[PDB]
Enzyme design. Sequence first.
Site, short mmCIF file in Angstrom:
data_model
loop_
_atom_site.label_atom_id
_atom_site.label_comp_id
_atom_site.label_asym_id
_atom_site.label_seq_id
_atom_site.Cartn_x
_atom_site.Cartn_y
_atom_site.Cartn_z
N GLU A 22 -55.73 -18.80 -27.22
CA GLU A 22 -56.76 -17.75 -27.28
C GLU A 22 -57.44 -17.58 -28.61
OE1 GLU A 22 -54.78 -14.15 -26.26
OE2 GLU A 22 -54.31 -14.93 -24.24
N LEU A 47 -59.94 -11.01 -26.04
CA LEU A 47 -59.32 -11.39 -24.77
C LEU A 47 -57.83 -11.04 -24.73
CD1 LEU A 47 -59.18 -15.28 -24.65
CD2 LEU A 47 -59.57 -14.00 -26.80
N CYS A 48 -57.26 -11.05 -23.52
CA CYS A 48 -55.81 -10.95 -23.30
C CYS A 48 -55.16 -9.53 -23.58
CB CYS A 48 -55.03 -11.97 -24.14
SG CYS A 48 -53.45 -12.24 -23.35
N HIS A 49 -54.31 -9.39 -24.61
CA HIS A 49 -53.96 -8.08 -25.13
C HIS A 49 -54.82 -7.72 -26.32
CE1 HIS A 49 -50.14 -8.82 -22.94
NE2 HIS A 49 -50.21 -7.51 -22.74
N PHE A 93 -55.06 -7.92 -19.85
CA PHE A 93 -53.83 -8.37 -19.23
C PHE A 93 -53.33 -7.31 -18.26
CE2 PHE A 93 -49.43 -9.84 -18.72
CZ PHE A 93 -49.65 -11.19 -18.57
#
EC number: 3.1.2.-
Lengths: 287, 286
Positions: free
Chosen positions: B74, B182-184, B209
């Site tokens: 990421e 992105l993601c957490h 997420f």
Amino acid sequence: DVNELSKQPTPDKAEDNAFFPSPYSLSQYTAPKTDFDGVEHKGAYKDGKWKVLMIAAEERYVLLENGKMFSTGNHPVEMLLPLHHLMEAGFDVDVATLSGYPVKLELWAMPTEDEAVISTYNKLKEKLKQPKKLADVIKNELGPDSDYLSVFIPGGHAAVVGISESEDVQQTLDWALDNDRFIVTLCHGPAALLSAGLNREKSPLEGYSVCVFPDSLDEGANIEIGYLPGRLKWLVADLLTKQGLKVVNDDMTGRTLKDRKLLTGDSPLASNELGKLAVNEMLNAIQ
Amino acid sequence: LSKQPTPDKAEDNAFFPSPYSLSQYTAPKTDFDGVEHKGAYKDGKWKVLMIAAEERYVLLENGKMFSTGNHPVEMLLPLHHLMEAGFDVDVATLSGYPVKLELWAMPTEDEAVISTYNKLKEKLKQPKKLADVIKNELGPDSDYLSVFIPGGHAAVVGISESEDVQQTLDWALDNDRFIVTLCHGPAALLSAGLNREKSPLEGYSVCVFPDSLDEGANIEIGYLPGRLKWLVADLLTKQGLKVVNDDMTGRTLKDRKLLTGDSPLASNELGKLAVNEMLNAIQNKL
């Protein structure tokens, strides 16, 4: 055997090109036990109000001149042993880091078989895993009527990193000076003191006497036995002298030193007696 | 084979993910299959400002700690796309400390991701300090066109409750710059609500997420050694943002200048997305 152990830095696999100290160096500079034969003043302070503020290492890795990284933290013995004396005396403790991140111990130096150090470490786990943000401390819990009697900065090599160039440490050392409170520090812990002389032409700690970890051993012996995997980019005692402080020592003997209210230790050896010195001085100043 | 979390001997009561969970969630190569705009921006002014994590340990509900960092996929895969388009990248952290990655997810055999890591190893090991960047390198005439906040579970610490990250997100809005996360990573957007009834990102739409995966499946295979104390999607929703997914499919979304991806699967597709939006913005001068 106990000198066929490797002199090569062991790698720490949480990080890129970063290393623990060699199994040899750990065989000479650590031990399962410390030289602690009990407390002098069990129960001396009773009123409950006075307490110690600890400023602590939250960053573990120290970038070195060869691009490798040393995997350190605060020294457990230098943190936990003095605090045992204090806490048993009846002084509570609060733990702060610069960011509120968790405190980083040099866990490879934990005296695993010491009832006092491990039991003290258990009583502090919470406050270690979840410290206070030191800026939150300056904002509320300092000032003239502060219940902090002294500010304790333990050693380890990690004490060099953030602690040495921090405006929030500077503000804390300004407070301590300007309200006659103790500053207690030992090993590389004195690198904290470099923060006092930040954005300034001269330091408020000029002409103060301190025990510091000698440059010689970092630039010489520690590298040759693989305790450190490379040279440090500057040396605590060298820059402390250029700030106008009297660095009294140059060897690692466990020597302690009072000077006004700046009580110091030269090394991990001085842990137990700096613990004893600070408790005496603190109880003295209550009179 | 084992679902038991693997111990980390740098830290007390801390654990890497279980060797089984590593076999499922990590791979030696990524689905990277080409840059789309090599050499497109040649004027060498506009750069990208990454805000990374300095803290690798995440204290959980059972007292155990999770040994994480930013996700290298990421982080690095999107930065490859943008670097090859001609945007240089400057790395910041909160206290100036060295950037912490989840090196257990580093795709060892992937040429593009590793190439990008080496190009940044120096800037990763001595990052700039975010508050210095605020003091000196922001404003209306700043050479940062985007600020990039990669995920990984360590985005949850520090970044999510940081007045410096808050000022940084204020700037981007008030100067029409991109926020790419992105993601957490979106846990960073929780800072915009800090000391404020209403967040300036109230109403924006993002991918995060899923709560389901961190509460259930990540625990069952020993990815996490315990339950997280709060959930990023739930806290974001409470600040008035609109969490648009409940699963990991590699989805992405662009709500005005805020570009999000839902997971590590979106790394490539998002990098693609961030370069198109940035180039399109430069073309919107005349």
